[PDB]
């Protein structure tokens, strides 16, 4: 009996090329993953620091949807955002908050008068 050698001296060298290129790419991915981990750790601190100023905008961006929040302590509580329909908008042309935000009124849902906020949100 004998072992059936095939006259294909190229299979072994093709395997080395794939194996060699696989080893280096996997090492680069590991190095990149470590760097991203450190960056995300720092970004967590910068997000907590900014939450102490304007909690509503920071929380909305994190969620991806319009929400409401209020920091009454070291734990931030998130409330639910009730929307309104475009039925009534008032834009007074005089400002006399020190008359900074315009005095506006709306109706439907409920109706009231107030000062226009930011990002199409009304008080």
């Amino acid at each position: 009996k004998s072992l059936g050698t095939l006259n294909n001296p190229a299979t072994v060298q093709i395997q080395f090329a794939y194996d060699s290129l696989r080893r280096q790419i996997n090492r680069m991915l590991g190095d990149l993953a470590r760097a991203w981990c450190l960056e995300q750790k720092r970004q967590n601190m910068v997000l907590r620091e900014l939450t102490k100023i304007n909690p509503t905008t920071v929380m909305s961006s994190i969620y991806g949807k319009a929400v409401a929040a209020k920091r009454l302590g070291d734990v931030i509580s998130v409330s639910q955002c009730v929307p309104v329909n475009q039925a009534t908008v008032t834009l007074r042309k005089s400002m006399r908050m020190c008359y900074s935000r315009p005095l506006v009124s709306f109706s439907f849902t409920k109706t009231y008068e107030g000062q226009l906020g930011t990002d199409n949100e009304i008080f």
């Binding site: 696989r22 991915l29 990149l32 995300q40 994190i62 302590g73 734990v75």
Partner: protein, 49 residues
């Protein structure tokens, strides 16, 4: 008036209402916000020619 503050110190959470405390909760008693936008790259497979 009503004053819900609930600080945190060490491995303990002290809850205060109306300038008074009545409860103590562990850290796991409250869910933790997460912000970890992360890659989902996968290592390349192994092939036997």
């Amino acid at each position: 008036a009503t004053s819900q503050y609930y600080f945190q110190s060490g491995n303990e959470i002290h809850v205060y209402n109306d300038y008074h405390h009545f409860k103590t909760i562990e850290l796991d008693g409250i869910a933790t916000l997460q912000t970890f936008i992360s890659l989902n790259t996968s290592l390349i497979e192994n092939i036997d020619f």
